Ligand binder design. Structure first.
Ligand SMILES: [Zn+2]
Lengths: 126, 369, 47, 204, 121, 240, 286
RNA sequence: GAGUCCCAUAACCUUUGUACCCAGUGAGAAA
RNA sequence: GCGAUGAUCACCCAUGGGUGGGUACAAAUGGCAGUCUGACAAGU
RNA sequence: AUCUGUUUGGUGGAACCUGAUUAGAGGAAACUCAAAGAGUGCUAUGGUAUGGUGACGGAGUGCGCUGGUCAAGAGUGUAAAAGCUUU
């Protein structure tokens, strides 16, 4: 179950990697990509220069959680619900969020690097 | 639109008349969802118009079961006929708010001029009047609703489980727990009676060692004898006559007092062996298979040392403590007691037949050696 | 009252210093200053 | 026991009422408790053994009262002066503690004061603490009438007067069983108690 | 509703009996009624297989009370002679229990049958 | 066996700790002198004669709420005046301990579906006079909507894979605003197809979607494997 | 709850209009207390009518989608339903009138060969249609004579019409010059109000059901509430996440306002932004 | 002056008289 | 002509006898184990 | 023991150091007088206020409304119907 955020969506569109097929190609498994409501609100707030990203994130295959907290700060929402539970993968490309997630333990980390996705703290990728 | 409300409760049925509609589109908003915790803004919404109480706990139990399985009873029919106005069956029926979406069709079958609403608006109006309760009713009911709910919940549970008091093992628990008590108590009080008559003639205590018979004779011998005919309840009468002749021990108010005390010992010892017969009959109609297998009194002490019939039956067949060939027949008897108690507890009305079979088995096994 | 605290001031010392009573037991670290309200009790074994 | 001997069943309580038991403020509570109740319904075949147990303990109460009347008559036949002074069963347990009446008669009055509290006495003597002051004489009627530390004071004066009356009881020969010595000693203790209840350590 | 309520039909019955024989071969099976209640209150039990046709039925109806106490799945199998044959003994058993082992070569079989009878219940 | 221990209160109101050379978790006894499931009792002599009141040990290997309490939870909502709705009162093992945490002035509604556990519940609730046994399926709360009203807490130890919907129904019906919710989750009972943290995350998400704001969870790991306790408060208007 | 009852992949082209109905069949009585009915026209040349399972009563105790499929020869643009007599009307390349029984248009009511972009029926006086054609035209239709009635041609094209619920002959047009004109039917030579505060092309209008104020959503990403007697704005609602608001309605409470943008979303706004929705005691109501 | 209403109405021990020994395991027993 | 509805698992002599470790109960004019102080106080 | 000197508990608290506070730190009393905070309890109930300023009420009458039955109609359906909708 792979929690996506906004710059993962933008970098996947800028690299032309599909979401579900890129995750299946990276992990060689199945994936439920998940968009929280704060990530979706951040994509909607990013403007109409990102309408492509908005209607690529509104996809039927991408399931969506519903975060219950005031405001739309995706990095604190992702970090809180990932150190809560230790069952997710965080897919991101923020330098700051990548450093937070790779400092907390037991949370794998997917990121668009090159021309397909790379995965960091998962020890069974091959 | 939610014009009337039906709240059923352990004292009776209440129909409320909705004064103001709570907000539909903002029904999840903060102020709308806290106006049903506030009372000064709930009495703006809901007002009581009718409360028909129940006759008693019998009618309350029948109405609770009918309200459970969603059937309109006669008291509910009567109160809805009194309160809800005769609307159309085809154009703008009157509108009742209930809490049960499968009580809905049952109410519309009887009153087809009534639309029954159970969505979240009627649901939280219902939970508003359940939250407030006695304040909304304007002081009109008799009976504490907490005690009503206690009695009704116990009634509903015993009905749904078919709880039997004829097959009630706490009776045999307390029967053997009292029988041991007054056995030791009669032992002490008859020891004191034998003591206070120990200095009238001290050969009665060796001729008659028995406590109850000692008391029953000494409540009519208090002097010298001279017609010692009924001194059996006859060789015992001859021994008592010879000792009463050549007695060798030494008042009046003491004699009256010790006769009252020996009479007390006699009444206690006739309540005992009456209680033996009572727990024998309750053993044959609560645990018949153990009573056939091991005996009624040993079965009583078996379930009282095991705590109850349920704890005895659910104990393992080795952790039953029954009270060489002799030393293995006891283990055999323990597991047969376990099996008979399982039959005995988990059958609804047990029989003597399998305990009789196991008694034949254990007698066959002791004559196997 | 102090008429009871001066009676049981010794086994409260042992409950305070449990970790010295047995070389193989090694309790987890609390201080356990004596509470204001307590009650001495005896364990009932069942039959 | 008397209320279950009268009513038996809850619906039977709903039809009856009763007044020789349970006076005047509790009937309405038992009627509402029978009208709504969480308890089951029992059968007659165990209600009869319940009623037999209930009449057994009503007979037990009557027996206990008869034995106490036996003890009262024996006490004001054996030591009537003590009986006028300290009371029937208090004097009974004093005689019962000390063994014989003459072995109580030959003991000093301070011992008769602390006759019951020996474990407190002897631990407070073997470590130099303060000894008890009431003893078995605490439940006498005069010490019940006194309030404060003058109950220890009149336990002292009551033990003195009870030693007087009791050694006169056990050591007289022409005793008249009339309570004269116990009565003049009890008048002395009563006016002593009155005069040290009339004082008050507050200033006016 | 009779007293031996979750009666496993034909497919679940032979599934249960196959895992009973494999657990008896690998010494993970404890067989008999009071052995079953001993291991049920001890805690080494995954699921428990009672029979539905013993000579009384309450002799092992004492078991689903402990099962609903300790959240253990229980299934009535329709033949005690077949259950004795499955356990691999020379006498008809009426109750058996699968003791909890983690080093076990049949954990997936035991768990698949356990999930199936949790759906059944 | 016969050793002497000192009773001291816990942080939670109503539950106590019995210190000796190995300390116990203990609660008071609402029916003194008889053990409900054979656990060992402790009998103080509370000082008119000094009365022998007594205390009963809460075994955490046989009780999920005891496992949560002594694993250490911040806020139970079970307190000495409360009305608790215990869902899934399997028999009266944990319900007795909940009942004498709750005390004589509070109520415990013990909901159970199976009938032989129901018989055990009524034979216990006679001598614990504040347990109301309710033998009914908890998934249809409109059946016992006539018997209970406005509990303060909802404990839920049912073993069903539609657990959060059962809890949502009974909480919306009978739990008051900012009332307490305690959930015992058994992962392998909810669904064995996923891992335990996935199913814990999903059930907590379901709770906050039915507007039970979750405060806290605990895995209760030396006692049960892959269980969890989630505490929440029923916020009813704006989890935010 | 703000949740969907149901979601239908209705058409393959754009769904270009939809409305609701109580479909008076002459042979089936539709269970209006459990089924709700909406029909929808598109530009795959179809008008489809659907039923919805609805949780509002508990009277009973299921055949949701596509109870019938009307079909045309050209595309359809807008649709509006009569409030009685099972009738509806669609605009497209031409404006047709239909009923829910026959699978063919009852009539064609076209002024000329200019296409039709929007329709609205009247609300009371329930037999006067009005339409916006893309030759800047506003054409009234009367169904008692089943014929067009009168047209006026404006400077820029009207995007929406909404009739007054409480005055029965007044309507309000929302057009491309960035203002909205309150018109009288019985004298169409002059607007009787002009609501003048947008900055781009006004895309939709609605009346409050009190007939007291209009709500007006435009192509600048903002909606505006105007009082009817003034002629300028009363309140603007905007958000950063609201883009190009195309469809605005006033909920039937007259207290809420539903706005549908083109980023995908449908939002609820208050009418009076400072008014809460609790019930108020007499001290704070006064 | 002075610690009992917290069991000297009792607890612990010692001797002497009444009844019993010195639970689990789990697949074998027998010839 | 078996059995999981349960197989198996301290001292003295050519069943019976004599000697010691405790279990529950009772007794004991058996032990612990010894019955406080001793002239002022209240009031005007 | 004009032996011994460690430990444990009490009493005491120099110097250095760290932390906090500073019209020095407190303590007792209440049917005392004040200034505030939180929680709780109470039908706490005008969604637009009685049934009526002889500008009025009551009786009765006509009109108006609701309910279901029956009759007649129209639509639909059919070989004809039956059946179903109807502001
Ligand atoms: Zn978020």
């Amino acid at each position: 179950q792979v929690l996506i955020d906004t710059n993962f969506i933008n970098f996947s569109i800028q690299k032309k990697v599909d979401i579900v097929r890129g995750m299946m190609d990276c992990l060689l498994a199945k994936c439920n990509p998940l968009i929280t409501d704060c990530v979706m609100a951040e994509l909607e707030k990013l403007g109409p220069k990102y309408r492509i990203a908005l209607k690529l994130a509104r996809d039927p295959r991408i399931k969506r959680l519903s975060c219950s907290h005031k405001g739309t700060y995706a990095d604190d929402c992702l970090v809180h619900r990932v150190l809560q539970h230790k069952c997710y993968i965080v897919a991101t490309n923020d330098a700051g969020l990548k450093q937070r997630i790779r400092k907390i333990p037991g949370i794998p980390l997917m990121s668009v690097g090159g021309h397909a996705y790379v995965i960091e703290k998962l020890p069974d990728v091959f | 639109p939610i014009e009337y409300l039906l709240f059923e409760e352990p004292t009776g049925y209440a129909v409320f008349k909705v004064k103001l509609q709570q907000d539909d589109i903002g029904s999840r908003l903060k102020e709308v969802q806290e106006q049903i915790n506030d009372f000064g803004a709930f009495t703006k919404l809901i007002e009581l118009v009718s409360f028909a109480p129940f006759k008693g706990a019998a009618e309350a139990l029948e109405n609770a079961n009918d309200i459970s399985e969603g059937l309109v009873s006669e008291s509910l029919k009567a109160i809805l006929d009194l309160n809800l106005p005769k609307a159309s069956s085809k154009k703008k029926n009157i509108t009742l708010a209930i809490s049960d979406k499968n009580l809905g069709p049952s109410i519309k079958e009887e009153f087809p001029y009534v639309d029954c609403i159970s969505n979240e608006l009627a649901q939280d109006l219902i939970r508003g009047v359940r939250l407030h309760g006695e304040k909304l009713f304007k002081g009109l009911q008799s009976g504490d609703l907490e005690r009503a709910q206690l009695g009704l919940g116990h009634a509903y549970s015993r009905a749904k489980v078919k709880f039997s008091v004829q097959k009630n093992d706490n009776h045999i628990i307390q029967a053997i727990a009292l029988l041991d008590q007054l056995d030791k108590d009669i032992n002490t009080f008859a020891m004191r009676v034998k003591e206070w008559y120990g200095w009238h003639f001290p050969e009665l205590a060796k001729l008659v060692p028995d406590n109850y018979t000692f008391a029953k004779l000494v409540l009519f011998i208090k002097d010298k004898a001279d017609d010692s005919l009924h001194d059996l309840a006859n060789e015992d009468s001859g021994i008592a006559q010879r000792v009463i002749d050549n007695a060798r021990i030494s008042s009046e108010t003491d004699m009256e007092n010790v006769c009252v005390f020996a009479q007390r010992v006699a009444s206690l010892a006739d309540y005992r062996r009456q209680l033996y017969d009572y727990l024998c009959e309750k053993m044959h109609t609560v645990a018949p298979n153990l009573s056939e297998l091991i005996g009624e009194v040993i079965g009583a002490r078996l379930i009282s040392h095991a705590g109850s019939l349920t704890n005895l039956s659910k104990q393992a067949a080795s952790t039953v403590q029954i009270l060489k060939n002799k030393g293995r027949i006891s283990r055999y008897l323990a597991n047969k007691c376990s099996m008979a108690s399982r039959i005995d507890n988990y059958s609804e009305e047990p029989s003597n037949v399998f305990g009789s079979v196991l008694k034949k088995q254990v007698e066959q096994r002791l004559e196997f050696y | 009252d102090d008429n009871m605290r001066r009676e049981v001031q010794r086994d409260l010392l042992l409950i305070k210093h449990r970790a010295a009573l047995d070389p193989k037991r090694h309790y987890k670290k609390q201080r356990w200053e004596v509470p204001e309200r307590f009650a001495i009790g005896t364990i009932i074994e069942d039959k | 026991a008397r209320i279950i001997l009268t009513m038996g069943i809850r619906s039977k309580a709903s039809e009856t009422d009763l007044s020789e038991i349970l006076p005047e403020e509790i009937e309405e509570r038992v009627k509402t408790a029978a009208e709504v109740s969480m308890g089951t319904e029992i059968t007659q075949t165990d209600l009869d053994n319940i009623n037999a147990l209930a009449e057994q303990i009503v007979e037990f109460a009557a027996y206990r009262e008869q034995l106490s009347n036996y003890l009262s008559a024996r006490m004001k036949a054996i030591a009537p002066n003590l009986t006028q002074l300290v009371g029937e069963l208090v004097g009974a347990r004093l005689i019962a503690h000390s063994g014989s009446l003459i072995s109580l008669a030959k003991s000093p009055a301070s011992t008769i004061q602390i006759l019951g509290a020996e474990k407190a006495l002897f631990r407070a003597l073997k470590t130099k603490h303060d000894t008890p002051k009431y003893g078995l004489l605490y439940h006498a009627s005069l010490v019940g009438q006194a309030t404060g530390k003058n109950k220890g004071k009149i336990a002292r004066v009551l033990a003195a007067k009870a030693a007087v009356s009791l050694r006169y009881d056990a050591l007289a020969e022409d005793r008249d069983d009339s309570g004269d010595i116990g009565l003049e000693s009890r008048a002395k203790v009563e006016n002593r108690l009155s005069q040290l209840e009339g004082r008050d350590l507050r200033t006016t | 509703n009779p007293k031996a309520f979750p009666l496993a039909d034909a497919a679940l019955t032979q599934q249960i009996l196959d895992v009973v024989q494999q657990a008896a071969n690998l010494r993970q099976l404890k067989k008999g009624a009071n052995e079953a209640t001993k291991t049920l209150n001890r805690g080494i039990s995954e699921f428990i297989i009672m029979a539905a046709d013993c000579e009384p039925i309450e002799i092992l109806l004492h078991l689903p009370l402990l099962c609903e106490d300790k959240n253990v799945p229980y299934v009535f199998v329709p033949s005690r002679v077949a259950l004795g044959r499955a356990c691999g003994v020379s006498r008809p058993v009426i109750a058996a229990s699968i003791t909890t082992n983690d080093a076990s070569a049949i954990k997936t079989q035991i768990y698949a049958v356990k999930d199936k009878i949790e759906t059944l219940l | 066996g016969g050793a002497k221990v000192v009773i001291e209160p816990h942080r939670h109101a109503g539950v106590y700790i019995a210190r000796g050379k190995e300390d116990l978790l203990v609660t008071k006894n609402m029916a003194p002198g008889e053990s409900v499931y054979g656990e060992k009792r402790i009998s103080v002599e509370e000082p008119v004669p000094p009365t022998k009141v007594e205390y009963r040990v809460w075994n955490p290997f046989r009780s999920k709420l005891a496992a949560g309490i002594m694993g250490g939870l911040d806020e139970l909502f079970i307190a000495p005046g409360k009305k608790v709705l215990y869902l899934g009162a399997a028999s009266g093992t944990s319900v007795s301990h909940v009942s004498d945490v709750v005390g004589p002035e509070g109520v415990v509604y013990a909901v159970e579906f199976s009938h032989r556990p129901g018989r055990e519940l009524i034979s216990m609730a006679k001598k614990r006079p504040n347990i109301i046994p309710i033998i009914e399926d908890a998934r249809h709360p409109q059946k016992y909507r006539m018997l209970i009203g406005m509990v303060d807490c909802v404990f839920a130890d049912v073993a069903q894979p539609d657990q959060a919907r059962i809890i949502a129904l009974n909480s919306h019906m009978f739990l008051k605003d900012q009332g307490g919710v305690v959930i015992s989750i058994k992962a392998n009972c909810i669904d064995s197809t996923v891992d335990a943290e996935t199913v814990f995350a999903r059930e907590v998400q379901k709770l906050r979607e039915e507007r039970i704001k979750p405060l806290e969870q605990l895995t209760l790991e030396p006692y049960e494997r892959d269980h969890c306790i989630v505490v929440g408060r029923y916020m009813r208007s704006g989890l935010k | 709850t703000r949740e969907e009852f149901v979601s239908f992949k209705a058409h393959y082209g754009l769904v270009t209009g939809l409305c609701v109905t109580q479909p008076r069949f002459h042979d089936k009585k539709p269970d209006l207390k459990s089924q709700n009915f909406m029909l929808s026209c598109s530009d795959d040349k179809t008008v489809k009518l659907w039923s919805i399972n609805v949780d509002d009563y508990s009277n009973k105790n299921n055949e949701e989608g596509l109870i019938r499929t009307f079909d045309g020869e050209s595309a359809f643009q807008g649709i509006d339903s009569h409030r009685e007599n099972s009738t509806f009307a669609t605009g497209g390349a031409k404006i047709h009138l239909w009923d829910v029984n026959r699978l063919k248009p009852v009539s064609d009511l076209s002024w000329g060969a200019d296409n039709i972009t929007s329709l609205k029926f009247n609300q009371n006086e329930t037999d006067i249609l009005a339409s916006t054609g893309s030759d800047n035209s506003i054409v009234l239709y009367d169904l008692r004579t089943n014929s067009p009635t009168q047209k006026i041609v404006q400077t820029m094209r009207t995007n929406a019409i909404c009739w007054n619920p409480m005055e029965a002959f007044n309507f309000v047009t929302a057009n491309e010059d960035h203002n909205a004109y309150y018109y009288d039917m019985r004298n169409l030579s002059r607007s009787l109000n002009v609501f003048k505060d947008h900055v781009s092309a006004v895309m939709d209008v609605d009346f409050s059901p009190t007939g007291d104020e209009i709500v007006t959503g435009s192509y600048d990403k903002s909606i505006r509430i105007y009082k009817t007697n003034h002629g300028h704005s009363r309140e603007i609602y905007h958000t950063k996440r609201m883009q190009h608001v195309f469809q605005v309605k006033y909920s039937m409470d007259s207290k809420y306002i539903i706005s549908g943008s083109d980023d995908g979303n449908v939002r609820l706004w208050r009418s009076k932004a400072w008014e809460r929705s609790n019930v108020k005691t007499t001290r704070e109501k006064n």
